[PDB]
Every structure is written in C-alpha cells, then in structure tokens.
Design a protein around this ligand. Structure first.
Ligand code: DLU
Ligand code: CL
Ligand code: MG
Ligand code: MG
Ligand code: ZN
Ligand code: ZN
Ligand code: ZN
Lengths: 252, 270, 69, 47, 48
DNA sequence: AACTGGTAGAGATTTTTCTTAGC
DNA sequence: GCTAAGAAAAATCTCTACCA
DNA sequence: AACTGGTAGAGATTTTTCTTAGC
DNA sequence: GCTAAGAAAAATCTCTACCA
C-alpha cells in the first residue's frame, strides 16, 4: 500500500500520469491519486454548443452542434424571428445540459426573447465547425431526398443517419457514443470532487512510534478500516488507526 | 350420512346461491363438497385473483401516451429504465404528427422497442412506416387496461403538478410545458442512485456500452471447456464454455444459455 | 391387443388430466363477466384464451381459472 | 365436477359392492365421500 | 511468416494475457438492481 | 374543541388428521 | 405393539376491486 | 403460444455522529 | 486520558393519491 503510494509518486515525478491510470495500475484509491495530481506544480468543454441558421429549398433550417463530439440537432423554422429561435433554444436546453452557447452576430440571435431564455435557463451567450456540419448535412439530405415527400422528414432522417450510422475517428465510434462517454466522464469527476471536500473537512492528531506526544494536525485524505492516509509537510504517510485521533476542523 | 345432505345442498344453492361455509355448516357436509357445489355454478364466479404483473424495463424501451391540458393535446414519451421525459404540444391528434414526433425521438436517442395503448393515432400506417424505416418493435397493450403503461401515466401526473407550480412564469402553454420538462429532468433528485433523470439515462447507456466491449475482449481469448452432468436423468451434454469458476459453483454457457452448475457435477478439460 | 389398449387408456388419462381448465374472464369497455373458455398459454401477468374460435389476451387480474379435482 | 361421479359410484356399489379406494381412483371423487358410500351399505365394512 | 508478423503476434498474445487478468475485475466492478418474483421493490446492489 | 374506510373472496403457505408399511 | 413416513384436509395470512 | 402498475412525498422508527461531564 | 450518557442529524421503512 505504502509501496504503491511511493511508486505512484515516483512514476508521476517521471512521466506526469493522470489519476485514473495511477488508480488502475498501482491499486490505490481514487482520492489519493487525485491528491497526487493536485500536489504537482506543473499540472495546474463538455457543455458548449454552437448554433447557426441556413436555407434549403426555401425553408429555414436551424442547426445546433455539440462541439466536442459533433452531435447535431436540427429543426425547420416557419420564420426567422426571435421567438422561434428562443423556443428552439428552450427545447435544446430542456433536453441536454447546456451551459455555454456560441452564436454569430445575426438579428434573431440578438433579441430580447433569446436574452430572456438565456437568463431563465442560466446560459452564457457569446458572439463570434458549424459550416462544415451544414455542408455534410446538406450532402446527406441530397443523398436521401427521394425517400421522403416533405422536407422535414428528410431533415430528420439525415440527422439520424449522421448521428448513429456514420462511424469514424480514433476508436471507430459514432457521435452518440462520443457525447454519452464525454458527459459520463464529467459526471464522475463532479461526484468525486464532492466526496473529496466532504472527507477533507477533518483533522488528525497522530502519535509516532516510541513516543508519547501527539504530533501536528495533519490533513485527512482517506479513512480506511485499519489505515489512515494523512498529508503533512507536502508528504503523504500511512498511519494505523490505533495511533490516530480524528477531530473536526472549523478553519474556513 | 350426508348424501341426502349433498342433494339438499344442491337444491338450496340452486334457489338461494349460498357460499360454501353456509352449506358446510347447515348440512354438515365436508368443505371439499361445498366448495365443489359453489365452483360448478355460472351465476357465481365473479372475482379476480388479486395479483399484479411487472412491465418491461429493458435499457432501450420507451412508452408513449397522449393527454389533455387547457384544451391542448400534449404527447409524452418516457424512457422506462431511467425516467427520462420528452414532451411536445400537438396541434391535432392525427397520425402524421405522431409519426413526426416518433421520428424526431428516434433521431435523437437510440430506440429499439416502443410500447403504446390502442389509440387511433398510434395504430396508423404513418407510424407503421416510421417504425419500419427506423427498425423499431412496436407493441400494444391489452385494450382498456391502463396499468400496462404505468410509467407514462405516472409521468403525466408529475408533469401536470409541475405545470401548476410554474404556471405564472410563462405566457403560453408551450413555454410552460418545456420549462416543466427541464425542471423534471435536471432539478429533481432522488431514486435509485440519488440521481436525476438525465444523469441516470447517461449512466445506464454508457454502462451498457462499456460492459459489452469489456466482455467481448474477455470472451475472445477464452479456453477451458467444461462437460457437465445435469437433468432428471444422469446424462451427458455437449461442449460448453466456462465463464466463471467460483467457490461453490461454476457458471457455464451452453447453446447461448447461462447456467449455474455445482462444482461436484462438472469436469474441466483444457 | 388388450395390454396395448390398457397402455393407450393410461396415457390418454394422463394427457386428459394435464390441461382440462376453464376460464371466466372480464373484458371490454363495459367490463362484464363472460362465459367459459379454454386456456392455451399461461404466462406470469396475462393469459391467452380460446373462445368461439377467437384468441384473446386477458390479464390474470381479470380472469378466474377453474381446474379439475 | 364429480357430483355425477358420486351418483355413478352409488349405482356401482349398489350393483357390485366395491371398496372405497377403487371407487376413489375410478370415479375421481375424494376419499371421504367414497368411505361414506361404503359406510352406508349394511353388508359392507370399510377396511 | 516474416519477422514483422511474428513480432506483432508475440506481443499481442502477451498483452492479451495480462489485460484479460485485469479486465475480469473491471467487469466485476459494476452494480445491478434486480427484481424478484411477486414483489414490487428493487433489491440491493448485487455484483455483476 | 369531540372526528375517522370497509367487506368478502382467491390463492399460497403452514398446521392438523388419518391410513399404512416396517421393525 | 409401537413408530414414523406420507398424503389428504382444514386453518391462516396476504392482496385486490368496488362502493354516484 | 410470448403478456404484465408505478412514482414521489409524508411521518415514524432505527442508526450514526458529535459534544461534554465524570472518574 | 479514557469512557459512557445524551442529544442532534442522517438513513430507512411503511402507506397514500392520481394518472381520461
Ligand atoms: C381511447 C384510448 C384507448 C382506449 O382507452 C382509452 C381510455 N383511456 C383511459 C385512461 C385512463 O383511464 N387513465 C387513468 C388511469 C386509471 C387507472 C390506471 F391504473 C392508470 C391510469 F392511467 C388513459 O390513461 C388513457 O390513455 C386512455 C386512452 O388513451 N384511451
Ligand atoms: Cl387501451
Ligand atoms: Mg392513452
Ligand atoms: Mg393514458
Ligand atoms: Zn504532474
Ligand atoms: Zn351459485
Ligand atoms: Zn355394499
């Protein structure tokens, strides 16, 4: 265990690994490897979307693309005013976690209805991939046009073919597997951060071997069944539980 | 004896329709004969059997229903294993808008099984053509039995309570419907893992994909064939793949069926 | 000739005592109780009954299955 | 049901004087009514 | 076989062995909520 | 400050009773 | 003569629909 | 022959945690 | 210094209305 912590610290000193790889290799828990990463001085987006509009056969299409995976949601608007763009933004924010929106300096994107929707849904709007996605979507639309009667059915069938039937990239996945994996990784990071702060609200007085004095207040990191990992003086050490006293610390 | 009691009890039930305890007490016949006298009557036998079933909860099953609110028509679709809600306001209750809503939902999320009631819009050629083109298995419930689609009617109740909570913050009803969908999906926690509905659908689909890839990489390099002895008769069956060897029992795969065999009735051959 | 008739009657008695059931079900909009039918398939939750050369699916909560002694 | 079985078992014991286990296996009536059919005959004794 | 096919085959076999021994515990680190017969509550987190 | 859900039947499971083989 | 296995029969417990 | 009730909140009761008096 | 009483706070179990 302590040999695992020493090997992990030497391995991060050489190669600067990440905490998932160290937790899998050296068989240490995740909070300890995250603290090893958090102590390195040389080591210190999944919710950004881009929106645009286009024209196709006299219809006004609006396209929203998740940037980090290439995930497309499209719709056919009856006009190009601000209320319909605000309604499309409200549906998009109600289905996926949207935290940062990037648009161009158009008329309908600079409107009081879109600003009210961004205020109620807590989205940061920023004015300046989407043109390449519009080009690829129009190629698919002209490829499967003869199987539909209206234009909305062709738009939604092209969205389905782009999202789940086209595979590429490094691992050979589509866009839906990429966006689900990215958001799941971010969720794991936030849950681990909550556990880290809740554990680190404590304090430990420990007694060394062949001594009867209590030592300085070291910060608790991991409280096991028989072992306790503490940080003191930029050093991690493992003390057994029968030589330690854990108190609360109100030191904000 | 009680044979004349049996004849008099049959005539008494023919006139008065007693239950079995009255005949067994008044005519001193045993209870099996009185239960048979009651059980061979057609004017009786009006009662169920007092049990409930359990609906399908596969990771790609969706359920759909329609509801009314303030003179509008809402259409609700729910992902069953997580509780994830998509809802829209329709201008009419025909089959074309239902096929369009189903096509948008199938273009966003992976759908492989759809469950509905027997309404006039769900049983239509447009919905059948969309299900054929998108390869969806469409199943219908037993008619006039709303308990088969329990999840979507429960979510109808939850959606209506949220809409009454946030009604004064919106002008139209479509804005209030979309705000209620956002409040349900991301602002309410509690359930299986303490998650909301969006975190739970992300966790379910990502875990399914990761466990399929992991067991493909495991099972492509396996060995250790196992011959087992089971059944009512002590026979011997063909070659099966060993999966997991544990203290007490072994897990085998035979004919794409998983079985758990005790360690005494199996033999491992490399 | 006689012994094979004994074996045939024993096997026919076992096959006849396998699945001689009657079902009183409740279906429709006005949920009234209807006459006897023949049970075909019995799964956990619903049953399939043959009535008047019509196949119907009734849940087990809306039907009563009478066996034989 | 087995009520017609009880009637036919009474006729069969009136003719041939069977025992109770034979009538219970042949006519598919329970054992209590078969023992009562044997008991109400003055010449037979259930054993 | 040439030399390149032999070195690729040898390294792939050894890596398959070691990563199999790790991936068994990786697939046993999941949690399952299941349902039994005639009870309407979801049972606790058994191991897959 | 002084009011309120209940009844009966269908199966499943546990207990009691009755006949008979074996030492 | 006495005892235990085994099966039939009676007793108890849990759960559902309907009452404007 | 291949179908099926469920979701979320209010209290009551049991378990865990945190501070302090007493030997 | 160590231990037990006591009270606050978090976790679990049972039960109800509503969904055309
Ligand atoms: C014309 C379509 C097809 C034929 O049936 C009708 C009537 N119906 C009735 C209810 C209903 O009574 N819901 C309340 C409810 C009551 C008890 C329960 F357990 C669950 C519940 F939801 C529906 O929900 C519903 O969707 C329909 C419906 O769609 N139709
Ligand atoms: Cl229906
Ligand atoms: Mg409906
Ligand atoms: Mg409904
Ligand atoms: Zn570093
Ligand atoms: Zn009657
Ligand atoms: Zn006689």
């Amino acid at each position: 265990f302590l040999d695992g912590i020493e090997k992990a610290q030497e391995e991060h000193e050489k190669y600067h690994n990440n905490w998932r790889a160290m937790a899998e290799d050296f068989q240490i828990p995740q909070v300890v490897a995250k603290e090893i990463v958090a102590q390195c001085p040389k080591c210190q987006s999944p919710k950004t979307w881009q929106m645009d509009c286009t024209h196709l056969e006299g219809k006004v299409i609006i396209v929203a693309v998740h940037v980090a995976s290439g995930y497309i949601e499209a719709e056919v608007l009856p006009a190009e005013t601000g209320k319909e763009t605000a309604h499309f933004l409200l549906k998009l924010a109600a289905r996926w976690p949207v935290k940062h929106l990037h648009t161009d300096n158009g008329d309908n994107f600079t409107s009081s209805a879109v600003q009210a929707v961004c205020w109620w849904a807590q989205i940061e709007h920023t004015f300046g991939v989407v043109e390449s996605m519009n080009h690829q979507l129009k190629t698919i639309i002209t490829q499967i046009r003869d199987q539909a009667e209206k234009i909305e059915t062709a738009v939604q069938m092209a969205v389905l073919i782009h999202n789940f039937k086209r595979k590429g990239g490094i691992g050979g996945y589509s866009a839906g597997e990429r966006i689900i994996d990215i958001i799941a990784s971010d969720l794991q990071t936030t849950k681990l951060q909550n556990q880290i702060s809740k554990i680190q609200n404590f304090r430990v007085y420990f007694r060394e071997g062949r001594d009867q004095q209590w030592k300085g207040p070291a910060t608790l990191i991991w409280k096991g069944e028989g072992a306790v990992v503490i940080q003191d003086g930029q050093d991690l050490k493992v003390v057994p539980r029968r030589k330690c006293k854990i108190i609360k610390d109100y030191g904000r």
